[PDB]
Amino acid sequence: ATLNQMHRLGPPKRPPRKLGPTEGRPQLKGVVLCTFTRKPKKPNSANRKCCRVRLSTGREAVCFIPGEGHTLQEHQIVLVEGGRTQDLPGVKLTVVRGKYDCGHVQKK
Amino acid sequence: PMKGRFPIRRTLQYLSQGNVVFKDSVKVMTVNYNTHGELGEGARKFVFFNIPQIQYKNPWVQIMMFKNMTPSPFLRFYLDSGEQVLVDVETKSNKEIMEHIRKILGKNEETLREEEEEKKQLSHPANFGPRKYCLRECICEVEGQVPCPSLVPLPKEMRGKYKAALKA
Amino acid sequence: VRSSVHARWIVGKVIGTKMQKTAKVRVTRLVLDPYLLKYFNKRKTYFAHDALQQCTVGDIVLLRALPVPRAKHVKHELAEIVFKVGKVIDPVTGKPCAGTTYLESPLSSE
Amino acid sequence: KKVRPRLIAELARRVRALREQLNRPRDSQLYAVDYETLTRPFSGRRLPVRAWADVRRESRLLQLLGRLPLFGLGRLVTRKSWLWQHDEPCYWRLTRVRPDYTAQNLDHGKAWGILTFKGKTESEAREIEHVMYHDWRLVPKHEEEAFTAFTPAPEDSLASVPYPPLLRAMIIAERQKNGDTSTEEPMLNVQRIRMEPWDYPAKQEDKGRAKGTPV
Amino acid sequence: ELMAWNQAENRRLHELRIARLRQEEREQEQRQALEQARKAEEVQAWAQRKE
Amino acid sequence: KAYRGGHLTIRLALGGCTNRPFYRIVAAHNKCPRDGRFVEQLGSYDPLPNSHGEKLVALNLDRIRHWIGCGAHLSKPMEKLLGLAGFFPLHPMMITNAERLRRKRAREVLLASQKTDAE
RNA sequence: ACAUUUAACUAAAACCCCUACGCAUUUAUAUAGAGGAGACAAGUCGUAACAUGGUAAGUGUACUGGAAAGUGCACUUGGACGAACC
RNA sequence: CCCCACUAUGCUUAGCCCUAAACCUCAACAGUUAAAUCAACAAAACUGCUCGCCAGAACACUACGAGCCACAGCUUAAAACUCAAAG
RNA sequence: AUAGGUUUGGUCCUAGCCUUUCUAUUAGCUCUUAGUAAGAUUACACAUGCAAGCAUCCCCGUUCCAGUGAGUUCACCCUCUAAAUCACCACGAUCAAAAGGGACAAGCAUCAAGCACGCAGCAAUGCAGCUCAAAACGCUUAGCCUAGCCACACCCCCACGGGAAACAGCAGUGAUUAACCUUUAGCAAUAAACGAAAGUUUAACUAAGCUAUACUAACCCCAGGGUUGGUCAAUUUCGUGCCAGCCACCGCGGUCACACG
Ligand code: FES
Ligand SMILES: [K+]
Ligand SMILES: [Mg+2]
Ligand SMILES: [Mg+2]
Ligand SMILES: [Mg+2]
């Protein structure tokens, strides 16, 4: 653009940073509503443990449960964080292991 | 690269090289130059190069420019007292014009030196406080004083926890 | 003087004469673009008191700040019609000019 | 550009000011005191401990003038304070008295007078202060002459004091630096400074007044 | 003094101009007359053509 | 800011760290915070002795004259500092305190001499 | 909305227009029901595109078809025409 | 897709509608072939000046809003979810 | 940026997304112990302790300080001129409101017209103008340009009166959050109150108690977190067999996995 055009337009402003599934929060606290397994997209093939939780903001979301083996049942309090599961489309939250009812993974 | 012809005119260094700081009396400067005509060559170079330099050192003076309104390029200054100052600038190089107006309406070197001295007095080297305004912040930054308990923990004697253990 | 009005002297161009004994004047001031470091003209309108209603749309006039604002928006008066629209008198020679041409030769009537 | 007028603010502003005038508390109401608890029932405040005795002891200004014809216009009245602490006669020459008609005993109100110190009468009469204080004591007529007897003491007083250490050292150098060789000890003119007594009656016109609301 | 000096400078410049203006017109006039004479000749010839 | 009543006062602004005070002579308002806005800084005061054993009291005396000439008041500890400096006379209560101390210490020699006599 | 005074040998008392929820208005959230897109990738039906893609492709527009799409009219090359004569 | 037949339509008149690969996808004006031409390809690389446009893909010549003689229209024109590419 | 990884069968050019760097908050796992600096998520409710008195009666203070960030071009300049302070019916400086003139956030133009927003006249009345694509008028976001300032003080912008008994003063609570300080002393320092004053209060403040939030200093004893396919410093042997699980990006795993445990 010309200098006259660059003046008339001004600074480049900025796209207002879109919030994440966690709503700009380090973590969020949810209530387990159900626990199921969703199969990843190809080329990958598995049955990844997810769970639908109701966040403290009202919005319900599917959260991936990391680690090997979970003991989460309905109406339990979990702490969820960010970080998308690259294999599972749509899943974008992750249960924190070792907080509230979700305990650490058993050694064996 | 930077846009425009002669991009140097859009740099602070070039804008701070202006030597014409009008007296407090000058309020409005009008430039009536011509766009064509060899006689007015100096007049338009002054508008191309120096009006940026003038307006910078003189941010409150209203500079106004008019093209091809009269057969001759001329300046005019409006002083606060009500005196107006026609400076005919036909057949005169832009640097000559730059020095002409400096002579008749520019501050002398004495006035500028005096103003620079005022800034020196604002920053008193002794005043302690935020480095945004001062040199040092505490007096523990002066050599040979009592240091700050942060870097070097002071003797238990000086600390108000063990001299109070001696009080009680 | 004690002029309460901020802008004491300002040269502008008449852009309106519909109001009574008041000329609307446009005043442009070069402002520094901080990013591009180029000066562009930022314009604002000023109401000027013209008791004699001698201003036409297109005259370059000089406005002097009134000691006290006459009206809500009238703070200046017509100090001088610097350039009369199409009736400019060469301020260097004093001879009537039409644009960049001396209408009457300076040698005709001295 | 335009600001929304805060109208209710202005309404209540006027309303409050007016209502205070209409409900002005009287001197008999403001300056009443319970001699049992030694607290003014209006504001429930305890007077200072060093005033407890004097309160129960002496009497107020218009407590004396209450029983005098025209409230003793033209009569000379001094206060216990002046008497006890100072020997020079100090008194008020009463000129006008506005008693508080609401008082059951007419022992409250205002009073004006002219102070005459060392034979100099003030150009105007001004209100008497501490009217509610239990200090005032009426001068018996038959000894007015003895009480008003005053002998002008000699005016011999101090005229100039030495400068403090640092200032003196600096003034000299200024003189010396300029070129003045005169070694005349620089001093002040404290004589001009009239050191008024600390207990001199102040201007009641500048003193405030309690609001209708105790709080 | 500086304002009086400026006016003298403007006056000095005015003399240089007023002389220059005269010299240019004197030379132009001779050139102008020749151009006008050329025009007249062309017009006269063309008038003969129509006649 | 516009305060509802007050006067220019020359005070000491408390800086420094915990158990490490350091004062700043400042011309402020009678209602501004102690460490808040001030009009002008008129010096400093190190209340703790330096490596050479002195208390360091810088005083912009030239400007102190101007501020006092405009109505600047002075706080109690500030008055006492100008006394010890010699710019103002010694504070009255300062003297009375020395006397009280010396009269306390008069009692002390009576009691301390006895202690040494016994043991 | 009304203002109408007493007092007056020191001068002082008295001195207050009243009016507020039509769930009106404003912007959202929830949705009986109806659609759309995207993802997902082993179903079904055809084979439109990519080669002259087996009728070159597409643009606008119109009409017409289970579905890709078909056809008209104009336009484009982001097709080609084999590059002396034959 | 091929053949035959026939209509709207193509024409005139009077109003609408306002869209195209409306693309020679290459703006107007003033200039330069000197340099280092110069990513590829295409129709060689550039300077001054101004205006108009653009800022991953796809959602999207879409939705809402607004205007319009246009009511299956046109012009302006997003977002959410999705992707690690698209080109 | 001194850059790097990633489009493809491959190569160039564009291009976005990531990586490497520095902070702050929260979590997991750890967490010997010395100074200093900081320390509710919430303008949503509070146990009911404590924070405004001093002064020989008046007056003065309690309007400051300390809080909070809900609302928000009233913060800065200029012109006039208050109220304060300078012992003073005189009256000049300093300081600083109201008023007048300029200046002054960020997005959205799919917010394009606003709807009386102007001038003249001493007036009665005449004029019909004023702003605006160089962004008027709106809508939504935000305390701000930290020697600090602005705004707010239980809601109704305000607070006569209503709604109702108010901690956005300190310490402390069940609630609500990812967001876990003590129901400690003292007025000698300390500034601010009160009389001229000895002086007398102050949850301001000064000293302490807590908290790996950060910064210095430490040790005979006192090391754990994460990572180890490439980008990117650094895996031996076993189980697992597209399962279980793992990645910030490319991507690993199908019985010989440096990528999982
Ligand atoms: S910085 Fe000087 S006492 Fe801490
Ligand atoms: K086809
Ligand atoms: Mg096909
Ligand atoms: Mg085909
Ligand atoms: Mg084809």
The residue among B39, B23, B40 whose CA lies nearest residue B31 is: B40
**Of C105, C89, C78, C65, nearest to C13 (Cα)?**
C78
Collapsing DSSP to helix, strand or coil, F72 comes out as coil
Inspect the interface and report whether the beta carbons of B88 and E10 lie closer than 8 Å.
yes
Which structural domain range is residue F109 located in?
1-115
Q: Which residues of F touch B124 (CB under 8 A)?
A: 41, 60
C23, burial (CB in 10 Å: exposed 0-12, middle 13-18, buried 19+): buried
d(C-alpha D46, C-alpha D55), whole Å = 12
Cβ atoms of A32 and A78 closer than 8 Å:
yes
Helices (H) and strands (E) in chain D, counts: 7, 8
* Beta strands D109-117 and D120-121, pairing class: antiparallel
Give CA–CA dist D33/D36, Å, rounded: 9
The CA F38 to ligand 3 mean position distance, Å, reads: 87
Distance from CA of E16 to the nearest CA of C (A): 13
How many CB atoms within 10 Å of residue F43? 23
What's the CA–C1' distance between A41 and H72, in Å? 40
Which ranges of chain F does DSSP label H, i.e. alpha helix? Answer: 61-68, 76-85, 92-118
Q: Which of B134, B135, B136, B138 to mutate to test the pocket of ligand 1 (most atoms within 8 A of CB)?
A: B138
Q: Report CA(A16)–ligand 5 centroid distance (Å).
A: 45
What count of residues does chain D have?
215
Return d(Cα C89, Cα C83) in angstroms, integer.
8
Cis peptide bond N-terminal to A43, omega within 30 = yes
DSSP string spanning chain C?
----SS--EEEEEEEE--STTEEEEEEEEEEE-TTT--EEEEEEEEEEE-TT----TT-EEEEEE-SS-SSSSEEEEEEEEEE-TT--B-TTT-SBEETTEESS-TTT--
Angstroms from F89 CA to nearest CA on chain D:
6
To which residue do tokens 């009680």 refer? Answer: B168
Write out the two tokens for D23: 């409900």
Which residues from B are below 8 Å from F24, CB to CB? Answer: 128-129
Residue in chain A nearest C31 by alpha carbon: A7
C-alpha span between A25 and C51 (Å, rounded): 67
Angle at C71 between CA C69 and CA C76, to 5 degrees: 50
Reference C65, options B80, D185, A29; nearest CA is: B80
Between CA C16 and CA C24 the distance in angstroms is 5
Buried b / exposed e across A32-41, counting CB within 10 Å, b at 16+? beebeebebe
Distance in angstroms: CA A54, C1' I178: 15
In A 32-71, which Cβ lie closer than 7 Å to strand H?
none
Instruction: Give the C-alpha separation, F76 to F37, whole Å.
Output: 20
H-type helices in B16-167, by residue range? Answer: 41-49, 51-57, 94-105, 109-122, 163-167
**A92 C-beta less than 7 Å away from strand H:** yes
- Most C CBs within 10 Å: which of B16, B28, B60, as the mutation test of the C interface? B28
Residues 8-37 of A with CB under 8 A from C: 11
Q: Which of B131, B148, B154 to mutate to test the pocket of ligand 1 (most atoms within 8 A of CB)?
A: B148
Resolution (in Å) of the shown entry?
2.4
CB contacts of A3 in chain B (<8 Å) are 3-4
Helix pair angle (B41-49, B94-105), 10° resolution: 70
User: How far apart, in whole angstroms, are the C-alpha atoms of residue C5 and residue C21?
Assistant: 20
- Asked if chain A contacts chain F via 3 or more Cβ pairs within 8 Å, the reply is no
Alpha-carbon distance of A59 to A79, in angstroms, equals 14
Interacting residues of A50 by C-beta distance below 8 A, sequence separation 6+: A35, A36, A37, A38, A62, A63, A64, A65, A88, A91
| Chains in touch with A (≥3 Cβ pairs < 8 A) | B, C
- The answer to whether A3 faces chain B, any CB pair under 8 Å, is yes
Q: Are B103 and E2 in contact (CB under 8 A)?
A: yes
Beta bridge partners of F26: F11, F41
Which residues make Cβ contacts (< 8 Å) with residue D157, sequence separation at least 6? Answer: D191
Structural method: cryo-EM
What lies within 8 Å, CB to CB, of F107 at 6+ separation is none
d(C-alpha F81, C-alpha F59), whole Å: 10
Which strand I nucleotides have any atom less than 7 A from protein CB atoms? 25-29, 34-37, 54-61, 63-66, 73-74, 76-80, 82-87, 89, 93-97, 100-103, 106-108, 118-121, 126-132, 134, 137, 147-150, 157-160, 176-179, 189-193, 195-199, 204-209, 215-216, 242-254, 261
Of the candidates D44, D128, D119, the residue with the CA atom closest to the CA atom of residue D78 = D128
**What is the amino acid identity at position D70?**
L
- In whole angstroms, give the CA distance from residue F30 to residue F42: 16
DSSP at D193: S
Q: Does A19 touch chain B (CB under 8 A)?
A: no
- Asked if D58 contacts D135 with a C-beta cutoff of 8 angstroms, the reply is yes
CA distance C4 to C68: 6
- Is the distance from CB of D199 to CB of D191 less than 8 angstroms? no
Helices (H) and strands (E) in chain B, counts: 6, 4
Who's near A70: CB < 8 A, 6+ residues apart? A35, A49, A51, A95, A102
- Coil, helix or strand at residue B127: coil
Q: How far apart are the first and last CA of chain F?
A: 66
Find chains touching chain D: ≥3 CB pairs under 8 Å.
F
- Under DSSP, is residue D127 helix (H, G, I), strand (E, B) or coil? strand
DSSP label at F39? S
B72 touches chain E (CB under 8 A): yes
- Residue in F57, F37, F41, F61 with CA at minimum distance from that of residue F49: F57
The verdict on the CB of residue B136 being under 6 Å from ligand 1 is no
Interface residues of chain E, partner chain C, Cβ below 8 Å: 10, 14, 18, 21-22, 25
Residues 6 or more apart whose Cβ sits within 8 Å of residue A107: none
For F45, the closest chain B residue by CA position comes to B139
Provide the residue type at D15 as one letter: V
Rounded CA separation D40/A27 (Å) = 62
Q: Tokens 């083996």 map to which residue? A: A69
Tokens 């209602």 locate to F31
* Nearest-angstrom CA–CA distance, D107 and D60: 7
* Contact residues, chain E, for B87 at CB < 8 Å: 6, 10
Spell out which residues of A between 16 and 75 contact strand I, using CB within 7 Å. 16, 25-29, 37, 40, 43-49, 55-56, 66-69
- Residues paired with D162 in a beta bridge: D187
Alpha carbon C34 to its chain centroid, in Å, reads: 28
Distance CA F49, CA B27 (A): 57
Tokens of A72: 């989460």
Question: Do residues C55 and C81 lie in contact, with contact meaning Cβ atoms separated by under 8 Å?
Answer: yes
Residue appearing with tokens 């460490």? F35
Determine the angle formed by the axes of helices E2-50 and B94-105, rounding to 10 degrees: 140
List CB contacts of B16: < 8 A, sequence separation 6 or more: B56
- Rounded CA-CA distance D184/B109 in Å is 44
Six-digit token pair at C85? 């629209």
Give yes or no for B153 touching F (CB within 8 A). Answer: no
Task: Give strand pairing partners of C47.
Answer: C24, C74
Q: Which two tokens stand for residue C50?
A: 């013209």
Residues of B whose CB is below 8 A from E16: 91
What does the alpha-carbon distance between residue A91 and residue A38 come to, in Å, rounded to a whole number? 10
Instruction: Give the span between the Cα atoms of C10 and C80, in whole angstroms.
Output: 11
d(CA B123, CA B130): 12
**Contacting residues for C49 by C-beta, under 8 A, at least 6 apart:** C21, C22, C66, C70, C74, C76, C77, C78
Contact A29, A55 (CB under 8 A): yes
Does the beta carbon of B138 sit less than 6 angstroms from any atom of ligand 1?
yes
D129 phi and psi, to 5 degrees? -90, 170
Q: In what order do the strands lie in the sheet with B84-88?
A: B62-67, B26-33, B74-79, B84-88
Nearest Cα to B104, choosing from B82, B85, B80? B85
Mutate to test the interface with B, among C26, C32, C38, C39 (most CBs of B within 10 A): C39
How many independent structural domains does chain F possess?
1
